[PDB]
Amino acid sequence: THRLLLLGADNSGKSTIVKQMRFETKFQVDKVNFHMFDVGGQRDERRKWIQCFNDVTAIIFVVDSSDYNRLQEALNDFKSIWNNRWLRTISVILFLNKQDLLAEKVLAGKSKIEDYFPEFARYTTPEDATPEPGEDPRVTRAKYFIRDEFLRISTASGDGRHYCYPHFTCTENARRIFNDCRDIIQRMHLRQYELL
Amino acid sequence: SSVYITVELAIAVLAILGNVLVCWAVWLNSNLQNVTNYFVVSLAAADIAVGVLAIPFAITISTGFCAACHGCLFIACFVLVLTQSSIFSLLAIAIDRYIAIRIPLRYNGLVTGTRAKGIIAICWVLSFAIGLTPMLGWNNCCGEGQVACLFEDVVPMNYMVYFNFFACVLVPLLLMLGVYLRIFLAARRQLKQMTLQKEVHAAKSLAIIVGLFALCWLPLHIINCFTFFCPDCSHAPLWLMYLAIVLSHTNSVVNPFIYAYRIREFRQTFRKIIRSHVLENLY
Ligand SMILES: Nc1nc2c(ncn2[C@@H]2O[C@H](COP(=O)(O)OP(=O)(O)O)[C@@H](O)[C@H]2O)c(=O)[nH]1
Ligand SMILES: CCNC(=O)[C@H]1O[C@@H](n2cnc3c(N)ncnc32)[C@H](O)[C@@H]1O
Ligand SMILES: CCCCCCCCS[C@@H]1O[C@H](CO)[C@@H](O)[C@H](O)[C@H]1O
Ligand SMILES: CCCCCCCCS[C@@H]1O[C@H](CO)[C@@H](O)[C@H](O)[C@H]1O
Numbered sequence: 001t002h003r004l005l006l007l008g009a010d011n012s013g014k015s016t017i018v019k020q021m022r023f024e025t026k027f028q029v030d031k032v033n034f035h036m037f038d039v040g041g042q043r044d045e046r047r048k049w050i051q052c053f054n055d056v057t058a059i060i061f062v063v064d065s066s067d068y069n070r071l072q073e074a075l076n077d078f079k080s081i082w083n084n085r086w087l088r089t090i091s092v093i094l095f096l097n098k099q100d101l102l103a104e105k106v107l108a109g110k111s112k113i114e115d116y117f118p119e120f121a122r123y124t125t126p127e128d129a130t131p132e133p134g135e136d137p138r139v140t141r142a143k144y145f146i147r148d149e150f151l152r153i154s155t156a157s158g159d160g161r162h163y164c165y166p167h168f169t170c171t172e173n174a175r176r177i178f179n180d181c182r183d184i185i186q187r188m189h190l191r192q193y194e195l196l
Numbered sequence: 197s198s199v200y201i202t203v204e205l206a207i208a209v210l211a212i213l214g215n216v217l218v219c220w221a222v223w224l225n226s227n228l229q230n231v232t233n234y235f236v237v238s239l240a241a242a243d244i245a246v247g248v249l250a251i252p253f254a255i256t257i258s259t260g261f262c263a264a265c266h267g268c269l270f271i272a273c274f275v276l277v278l279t280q281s282s283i284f285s286l287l288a289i290a291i292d293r294y295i296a297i298r299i300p301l302r303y304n305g306l307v308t309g310t311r312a313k314g315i316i317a318i319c320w321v322l323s324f325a326i327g328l329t330p331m332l333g334w335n336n337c338c339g340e341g342q343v344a345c346l347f348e349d350v351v352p353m354n355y356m357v358y359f360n361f362f363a364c365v366l367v368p369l370l371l372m373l374g375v376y377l378r379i380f381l382a383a384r385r386q387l388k389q390m391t392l393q394k395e396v397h398a399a400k401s402l403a404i405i406v407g408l409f410a411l412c413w414l415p416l417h418i419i420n421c422f423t424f425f426c427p428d429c430s431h432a433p434l435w436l437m438y439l440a441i442v443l444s445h446t447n448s449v450v451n452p453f454i455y456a457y458r459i460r461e462f463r464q465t466f467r468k469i470i471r472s473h474v475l476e477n478l479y
Contacts, residue, residue, distance in 0.1 A: 002301060032301045163390070178301075186300040187386050192232075193293070194458055195383045195398050 001026075001033040002181055003055060005090075007040025007081070008062030009074055013097045014040060017062060021174055029178045036060065042077050051086060057181055059092045065146050065168075066101040068116045079153050082164075091162040092154075093180045096147055100170045106139045113142055120145055143168060163187075200258060200438040204251055207445050211247030214452035215240040221456070221465040228461055234312045235292050236455055238319065239285040242278065243448040250278040251445055258438075260344035265337035268345035269330055276351075277327030280364050282448060284319035286409070287368045289455065290375045291315075297379045326363060330355055353424040361417045369410060376402045405454055412447035416440035 006025075008014040018038060021027050025036040039049040040062075059081065063074040081087060105111060114120045123145050125131075131140040147166050154164035165180045167173075190196055218240040222228045253275050257268075296303050336352050343349065383398045419432050419440055456462045 030301075182300050183386065183389075185303070186297055186382060189293070189296040189300060189303075190379075190383050190386060192459070193379075193401075194460065195379070195401065196387075196394075 001035050002057045003053060004034055004036040004177070004181075005050070005053070005056045005059040006036050006038045006062070007046065007059065008095075008097075009041050009064065009067075009070055009077070010043075011067070012062045012064040012074070014038065014062040017060075017095065017097070017169070017173055027174060029174050032178070034177070034181075042073075042080075050084075054086075056090060058177075058184055059087065059090050060095065060177065061092050062095045062097050063146075063150070064098050064101075065096045065143065066098045066105050068105075068111060068113060071146065071149075072116070075149060075153065078150055082153055083157060089161045091180075091184045092164045093177055094150060094164050094166045095169045095173070096143070096150075096166060097169050099143065099168050102143060102146075103136075103139050106142050107136060113145065117145070117149070123148075197434075197438060200442070201255055203438075203442055204255055204445065207442065207449055208247040208251040211243055211251070211445075211448040214449060215243045215247070217466065217469070218452050218456045218462070219244070221462055221469065224469070225461065225465045228465065231307055231309050231312050232292060232296075234309070234316065235285065235289045238316045239282065239289060239451060239455065242282040242285045243451050245278050246282055246445065246448045250275050254441065254445070257345060257347045258441075260346050262338035262342045263345045264341060265335075265343050265350060266331075268343065269335050269337060269350040271345070272347050272351050273328050273331055275347075276360070277323045279444070280327050281320050281323040282451070283364055283368055283413070284322060285316070286451065287372060288315055288319055290372045293379055294375045297382045326360065329359065348423070353420060356417075356420050357424045361420060365413050365417050369406070369413070372409065373406050376406055401458070408450050408454060409447065412443050412450070416444045 006014060006018060015038075018025050018036065021036075023038040025038070027034050027036070037049060037053075039046050061078060061081065063078075064070065078092075081092065120142075123141070125137065125141045125144055126148075129140065129144050131137070147168075151164060151166065163184075165183070167176050169176075187196070219237060222233055222237055253271050257272055257275065292307065295307060299306065330351055334352060334355055336350055338344065380399055380402045384395050387394050387398070419436065422429065423431060457466075
């Protein structure tokens with residue numbers, strides 16, 4: 001059975017992601033048991049439960065992409081999780097949540113991200129980026145800017161013992177988690193043969 | 197021929213040294229003591245038996261010494277059993293890595309320490325069953341009632357070509373080839389997620405595993421097919437036989453290296469053992 005650590009801010013939808021899948025949560029995918037635990041925000045309840053376990057296969061990290069201000073808080077929390085002594089070799093499945101709400105926010109035009117993140121003004125959408133049919137290039141650009149904001153941290157401590165697997169979430173989250181765990185442990189075996 | 201005997205004896209020594217070193221490393225190092233290495237230790241155990249028992253028995257079969265036909269068949273069959281177990285324990289590693297890459301989540305729930313012993317036992321029961329099959333009647337059987345003890349005199353070539361080559365070399369090779377190409381594909385997928393220099397290196401490493409197995413085992417068995425299917429052909433020369441036989445046994449020298457020496461954990465353990473053995477004499 002595969003242990004998961006769920007964490008993220010208040011009103012980051014971390015409670016809804018676990019609602020759809022149905023604190024302690026055990027779900028079935030492809031006849032493979034998972035056992036998730038909800039322990040996050042950075043306010044409290046985190047440092048108690050985190051130091052118990054040890055054998056978590058992966059850390060599910062949920063951030064609200066729409067909340068530009070609390071995004072900085074989320075970035076700090078992520079940096080902390082990424083450099084934590086207890087979680088140093090544990091891979092993070094990253095959910096960038098409330099994508100729909102982000103689309104609305106961005107298309108509206110009231111709040112400009114450059115205000116909260118000035119280096120966005122010199123940011124262009126990546127060439128590898130694969131926007132979906134009917135996605136405003138503006139929305140795509142912002143979306144991928146946030147994603148990259150979290151990824152720069154992952155690549156800052158570029159040891160390669162652990163990796164950060166991003167997602168854009170508005171359907172099938174269980175399968176994403178599944179696939180990402182599959183990848184993690186399959187890459188553990190591939191690394192074990194020096195095939196990496 | 198003296199050259200055959202001594203080259204064969206060299207390999208036996210190198211086979212014992214390298215494989216004892218692999219086994220010794222698992223005994224000492226605590227991190228190497230896990231289910232995945234049961235398959236490596238079984239392989240290494242089998243290869244020691246090839247060095248200690250199978251090669252000396254193979255040397256005797258080369259001399260055509262005087263013995264009862266069924267005594268000569270027993271020795272030849274003993275060489276077959278031990279070499280077969282080396283090949284099947286090699287296949288077991290590939291099946292393990294196949295489960296690991298194809299079904300990575302259930303790996304720990306499927307591949308238990310007890311079930312791994314099941315697999316290893318099956319490898320050795322299949323070795324005895326196949327290698328002793330000629331003892332049951334499928335055979336070609338000095339003072340009266342003695343013969344020159346030679347391999348191709350007692351062990352029939354239809355057994356070697358239709359049963360032994362098919363079951364013990366060809367099928368394993370095909371399975372291993374297929375398994376390692378699927379493991380490679382998974383590696384190149386994950387490489388793309390995170391330099392085609394890294395992909396080329398990966399491909400090369402898996403090519404070496406299967407390529408060496410084919411280089412060691414196919415020559416002798418290809419020749420055996422030639423012998424069987426062309427009874428009118430003048431038989432393969434005796435220097436070529438010694439070369440091919442030697443090549444097949446040299447799988448037991450490279451089997452340590454490619455498998456174990458491809459693990460960093462084994463590599464570091466080898467340092468500490470050789471170093472601490474020299475620190476021990478120089479005080
Ligand atoms: N549109 C949209 N709204 C969301 C999503 N996730 C959460 N919400 C809203 O955010 C509110 C708080 O979510 P909740 O899961 O309780 O946050 P948590 O307690 O921090 O996990 C709810 O009332 C939801 O309506 C999402 O993916 N899309
Ligand atoms: C399971 C396959 N085992 C072998 O090929 C071993 O059996 C012996 N062997 C097979 N065919 C012959 C042959 N034609 N002449 C002598 N030895 C043989 C060699 O010692 C090989 O190492
Ligand atoms: C969880 C309950 C397990 C009960 C035991 C199952 C029966 C098979 S035992 C297994 O049989 C192999 C023969 O194939 C031997 O080689 C091994 O030594 C031995 O371990
Ligand atoms: C596995 C079958 C071969 C067994 C014999 C081992 C010989 C390797 S000696 C040792 O190897 C280290 C890595 O092990 C290297 O870093 C060093 O250069 C060297 O000092």
